[PDB]
Amino acid sequence: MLDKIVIANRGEIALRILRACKELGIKTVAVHSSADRDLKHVLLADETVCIGPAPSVKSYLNIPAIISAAEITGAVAIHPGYGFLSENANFAEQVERSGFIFIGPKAETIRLMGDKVSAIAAMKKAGVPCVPGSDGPLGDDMDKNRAIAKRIGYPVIIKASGGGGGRGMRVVRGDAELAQSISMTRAEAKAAFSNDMVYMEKYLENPRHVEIQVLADGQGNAIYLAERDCSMQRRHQKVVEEAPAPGITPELRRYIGERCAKACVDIGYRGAGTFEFLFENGEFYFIEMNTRIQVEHPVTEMITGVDLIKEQLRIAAGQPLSIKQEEVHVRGHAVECRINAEDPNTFLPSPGKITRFHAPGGFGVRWESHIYAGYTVPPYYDSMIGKLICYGENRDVAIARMKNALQELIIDGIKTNVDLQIRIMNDENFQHGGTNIHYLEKKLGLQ
Amino acid sequence: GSHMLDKIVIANRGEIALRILRACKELGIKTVAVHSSADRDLKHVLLADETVCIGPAPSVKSYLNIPAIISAAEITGAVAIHPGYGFLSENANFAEQVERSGFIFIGPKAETIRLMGDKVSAIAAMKKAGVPCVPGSDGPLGDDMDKNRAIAKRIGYPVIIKASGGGGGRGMRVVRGDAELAQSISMTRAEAKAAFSNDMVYMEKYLENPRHVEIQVLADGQGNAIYLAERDCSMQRRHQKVVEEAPAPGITPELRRYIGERCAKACVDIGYRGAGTFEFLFENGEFYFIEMNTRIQVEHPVTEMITGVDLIKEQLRIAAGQPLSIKQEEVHVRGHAVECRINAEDPNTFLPSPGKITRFHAPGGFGVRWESHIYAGYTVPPYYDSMIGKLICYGENRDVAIARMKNALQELIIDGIKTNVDLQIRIMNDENFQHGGTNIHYLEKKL
Ligand SMILES: Nc1ncnc2c1ncn2[C@@H]1O[C@H](COP(=O)(O)OP(=O)(O)O)[C@@H](O)[C@H]1O
Ligand SMILES: Nc1ncnc2c1ncn2[C@@H]1O[C@H](COP(=O)(O)OP(=O)(O)O)[C@@H](O)[C@H]1O
Numbered sequence: 001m002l003d004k005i006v007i008a009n010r011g012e013i014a015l016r017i018l019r020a021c022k023e024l025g026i027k028t029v030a031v032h033s034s035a036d037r038d039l040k041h042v043l044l045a046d047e048t049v050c051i052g053p054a055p056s057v058k059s060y061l062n063i064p065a066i067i068s069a070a071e072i073t074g075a076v077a078i079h080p081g082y083g084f085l086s087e088n089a090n091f092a093e094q095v096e097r098s099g100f101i102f103i104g105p106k107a108e109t110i111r112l113m114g115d116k117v118s119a120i121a122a123m124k125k126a127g128v129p130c131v132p133g134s135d136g137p138l139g140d141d142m143d144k145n146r147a148i149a150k151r152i153g154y155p156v157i158i159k160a161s162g163g164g165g166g167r168g169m170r171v172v173r174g175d176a177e178l179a180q181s182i183s184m185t186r187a188e189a190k191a192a193f194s195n196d197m198v199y200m201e202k203y204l205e206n207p208r209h210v211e212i213q214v215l216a217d218g219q220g221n222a223i224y225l226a227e228r229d230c231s232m233q234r235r236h237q238k239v240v241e242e243a244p245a246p247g248i249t250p251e252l253r254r255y256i257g258e259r260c261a262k263a264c265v266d267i268g269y270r271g272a273g274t275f276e277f278l279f280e281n282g283e284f285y286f287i288e289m290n291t292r293i294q295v296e297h298p299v300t301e302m303i304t305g306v307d308l309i310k311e312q313l314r315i316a317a318g319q320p321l322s323i324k325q326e327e328v329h330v331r332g333h334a335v336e337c338r339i340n341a342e343d344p345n346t347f348l349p350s351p352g353k354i355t356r357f358h359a360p361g362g363f364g365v366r367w368e369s370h371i372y373a374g375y376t377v378p379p380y381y382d383s384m385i386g387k388l389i390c391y392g393e394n395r396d397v398a399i400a401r402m403k404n405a406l407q408e409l410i411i412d413g414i415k416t417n418v419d420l421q422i423r424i425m426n427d428e429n430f431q432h433g434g435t436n437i438h439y440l441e442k443k444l445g446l447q
Numbered sequence: 448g449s450h451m452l453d454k455i456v457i458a459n460r461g462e463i464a465l466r467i468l469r470a471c472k473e474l475g476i477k478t479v480a481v482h483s484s485a486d487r488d489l490k491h492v493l494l495a496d497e498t499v500c501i502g503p504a505p506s507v508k509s510y511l512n513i514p515a516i517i518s519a520a521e522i523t524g525a526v527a528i529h530p531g532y533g534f535l536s537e538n539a540n541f542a543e544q545v546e547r548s549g550f551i552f553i554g555p556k557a558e559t560i561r562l563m564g565d566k567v568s569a570i571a572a573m574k575k576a577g578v579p580c581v582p583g584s585d586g587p588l589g590d591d592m593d594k595n596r597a598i599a600k601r602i603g604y605p606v607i608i609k610a611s612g613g614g615g616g617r618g619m620r621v622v623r624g625d626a627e628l629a630q631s632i633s634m635t636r637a638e639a640k641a642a643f644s645n646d647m648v649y650m651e652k653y654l655e656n657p658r659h660v661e662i663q664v665l666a667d668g669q670g671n672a673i674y675l676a677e678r679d680c681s682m683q684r685r686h687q688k689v690v691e692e693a694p695a696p697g698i699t700p701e702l703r704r705y706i707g708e709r710c711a712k713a714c715v716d717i718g719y720r721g722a723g724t725f726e727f728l729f730e731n732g733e734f735y736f737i738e739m740n741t742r743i744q745v746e747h748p749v750t751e752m753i754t755g756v757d758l759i760k761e762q763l764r765i766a767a768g769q770p771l772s773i774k775q776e777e778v779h780v781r782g783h784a785v786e787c788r789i790n791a792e793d794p795n796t797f798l799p800s801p802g803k804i805t806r807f808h809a810p811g812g813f814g815v816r817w818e819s820h821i822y823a824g825y826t827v828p829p830y831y832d833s834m835i836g837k838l839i840c841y842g843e844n845r846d847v848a849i850a851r852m853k854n855a856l857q858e859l860i861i862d863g864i865k866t867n868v869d870l871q872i873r874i875m876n877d878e879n880f881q882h883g884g885t886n887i888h889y890l891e892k893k894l
């Protein structure tokens with residue numbers, strides 16, 4: 001019944017969604033900005049509609065233009081991908097009210113779980129352990145704020161409730177920096193996400209980032225698809241993700257997986273989502289839920305055989321999961337390296353025209369990207385231009401294949417992080433596995 | 448497990464040389480690329496640790512230059528040579544010379560190449576082993592036409608003349624009656640002598656309605672052997688394969704086990720070592736042996752997708768003296784995979800299309816695998832086979848595999864030369880291919 005869907009996104013994820021539609025005989029409508037007319041998926045799409053000028057605020061965040069596009073092409077559903085309006089409760093409400101299927105959760109669920117402050121409360125209520133913190137928004141009373149920081153114990157982190165992508169988070173190591181770190185985060189969050197709401201959380205020094213993939217049909221069925229380790233980070237943003245997570249025992253996998261599946265049923269969750277945790281000394285601590293598909297979804301696909309984009313579409317078309325928990329089986333290992341148009345050392349954005357391009361191939365090699373020779377990477381958007389995912393019968397083979405595939409990958413004409421990713425694959429501690437969320441920056445000697 | 452071979456010479460070119468190169472690099476084996484003077488810019492040559500030019504462009508002077516190839520191993524201090532497919536891979540003289548010079552032939556023992564590689568000797572052995580063959584001259588044809596007419600009378604007059612030392616569909620002519628017989632034997636002998644340096648021909652009954660079904664084997668040479676399902680390769684032009692798939696449609700679990708066990712038994716009985724394929728004509732529920740490839744095959748990736756076994760790595764493990772790791776009961780068929788060969792030829796007149804590839808884009812996505820050395824800027828030489836790449840698509844079922852293939856072929860861009868991409872698109876759209884079980888004559892009849 002999903003004859004035509006609007007892909008409310010761009011770049012690599014838009015192409016990912018397009019491919020899934022194409023395989024399923026579903027008509028595609030590519031909505032794009034005036035800077036994105038030459039996107040790969042825009043050229044492969046059945047229909048195209050320019051929804052605004054180059055800036056995201058004036059295009060991909062343009063709610064009325066996106067709905068109008070669905071309206072005028074007579075689409076039935078809208079896939080928001082990740083970022084942009086995918087976790088915008090207002091968007092979902094309006095799409096559904098306009099008579100279109102929103103390929104994601106109900107808006108009440110987006111507001112419960114997509115907003116971080118409310119998410120933590122709902123998880124402390126439902127029987128999921130969280131990181132000790134302010135357990136509410138922070139007020140302007142700075143004596144009250146200091147008491148909190150003393151309860152949980154420095155270092156602490158100030159986090160934006162409406163934040164994402166590593167934005168709106170500042171680490172506080174003592175009272176001397178607390179007032180100004182709160183103020184600057186409120187400001188950064190206000191200008192980046194609207195919402196100036198911030199809370200306080202204990203800053204964990206030695207955890208790993210372990211996240212649990214879930215699918216739920218909104219009819220009372222909910223499964224978990226093992227986990228992903230995403231501990232290799234810079235500026236609180238993921239650089240390498242892998243699945244399964246090393247060193248996670250079957251007893252722990254089942255413990256935490258069942259909690260997340262239970263949480264989904266208890267909240268009536270609908271679609272794909274990810275529960276993100278800080279994992280340290282054998283314990284999981286909930287930090288946030290992404291109520292949407294995630295960038296790193298392919299590594300889970302490769303180890304399970306489950307097509308998560310197709311599953312999202314199954315759920316949106318009103319069909320229950322026909323995958324049961326005992327039918328989920330992990331085989332092998334997959335690693336994903338994000339490819340970013342940025343300086344390999346300074347990490348400042350590198351827009352420009354790609355003058356030469358060559359993609360890697362081979363058994364277990366999966367290249368996810370819209371880039372091509374002669375494609376100009378625009379300055380307006382996130383720097384991630386592609387994803388390289390390698391699968392292998394085991395983790396050593398996955399990493400060996402990634403080294404090989406990074407050696408084949410050519411992207412000339414702009415700076416990229418390919419050199420960085422080769423360095424990480426060659427890191428003896430990454431090869432042993434289980435490095436923490438602070439490792440990459442420590443290795444790079446980043447003050 | 449034991450240490451891998453330190454260093455190998457890859458004694459081939461094109462897509463199979465790159466495939467072997469990738470396997471070496473995952474296993475930490477150093478690579479030596481021997482190449483002709485026309486192949487300096489091959490992708491695997493550009494990736495190889497060491498390169499040696501073994502002669503000028505013509506294959507006779509380079510990839511068939513036995514002493515140059517062996518000398519190359521010695522100069523680089525390689526310990527083994529992998530012959531790929533074609534060229535010297537089923538040349539028993541080469542395998543002997545390789546061993547007598549102190550290197551490992553990553554292949555069967557030379558004795559086994561003579562027994563099973565030669566088509567006349569292989570028919571004889573299999574018949575003595577109690578393996579059904581196609582009725583035929585059961586011996587080389589001589590020069591007196593009365594005796595040759597008499598053999599055709601016995602078996603029945605669609606007959607085919609086949610070169611004992613032939614391969615790639617070459618050195619084969621169908622004969623409909625007496626009038627054509629003398630000239631057909633004569634032309635087949637002359638073609639064989641020029642192509643394979645062996646003018647030996649035999650006569651076989653020409654089967655009207657069979658499918659091409661072949662069984663993958665893997666033997667450690669120590670007495671253990673397994674099979675890895677079957678492949679159907681019935682879509683052919685000039686008796687050479689165009690599309691391959693695995694598993695073969697209409698082959699049951701019970702039937703697969705029947706033929707697989709017999710092939711595995713045959714390996715133990717003849718002392719086979721390495722990867723191999725037994726090729727059958729499958730007609731009226733019965734298998735009839737036609738040949739054994741005593742080497743890796745072009746289409747090995749379809750079997751890898753549906754079994755998870757890395758056939759090249761297994762070749763290298765076995766050549767390192769490792770016994771088979773994989774037991775028969777560990778081998779499981781999952782899903783379905785299709786391969787479309789990509790050839791630089793006119794899609795309609797099949798005229799060779801050498802030249803510079805000016806634009807190139809590989810297909811990507813879940814379940815899509817691309818096996819090719821080609822790149823934008825690369826010149827396809829006129830000296831060698833037209834096959835420039837292989838596209839392989841996997842799905843949870845055959846319908847999914849075929850829809851994915853369609854889409855992948857549509858994404859593929861190769862400008863500058865003519866290719867058969869458009870024929871493969873016609874084939875995926877063919878109602879009878881979609882049905883399955885089309886016979887070996889279908890593609891040419893469709894045309
Ligand atoms: N709440 C949000 N609002 C707007 N954009 C977001 C939000 N969360 C994430 N994004 C954006 O979506 C993209 C993917 O986010 P990222 O955190 O890199 O991946 P993931 O969370 O899927 O692992 C980034 O460009 C990021 O800035
Ligand atoms: N309490 C904490 N202690 C230590 N690190 C944290 C904490 N909260 C977040 N982080 C760091 O920031 C990363 C992203 O956290 P998250 O809350 O999911 O932010 P985002 O919304 O940007 O995805 C984590 O992987 C971790 O490295």
Ligand SMILES: Nc1ncnc2c1ncn2[C@@H]1O[C@H](COP(=O)(O)OP(=O)(O)O)[C@@H](O)[C@H]1O
Binds near residue numbers: 746
């Ligand atoms: N006995 C042989 N002598 C020389 N070349 C061969 C021989 N057998 C196969 N080839 C070549 O090897 C390549 C692969 O053979 P082909 O028949 O296409 O694949 P396969 O038999 O692996 O399915 C082709 O170029 C073919 O011409």
Ligand SMILES: Nc1ncnc2c1ncn2[C@@H]1O[C@H](COP(=O)(O)OP(=O)(O)O)[C@@H](O)[C@H]1O
Binds near residue numbers: 581
């Ligand atoms: N007896 C036969 N009757 C009909 N077709 C045949 C026969 N033998 C071979 N062929 C056709 O030629 C193809 C190649 O046969 P094969 O002996 O494997 O030659 P090659 O060494 O060239 O691979 C087969 O797949 C089949 O389609």
Ligand SMILES: [Mg+2]
Binds near residue numbers: 276288
């Ligand atoms: Mg997060």
Ligand SMILES: [Mg+2]
Binds near residue numbers: 726738
């Ligand atoms: Mg053959």
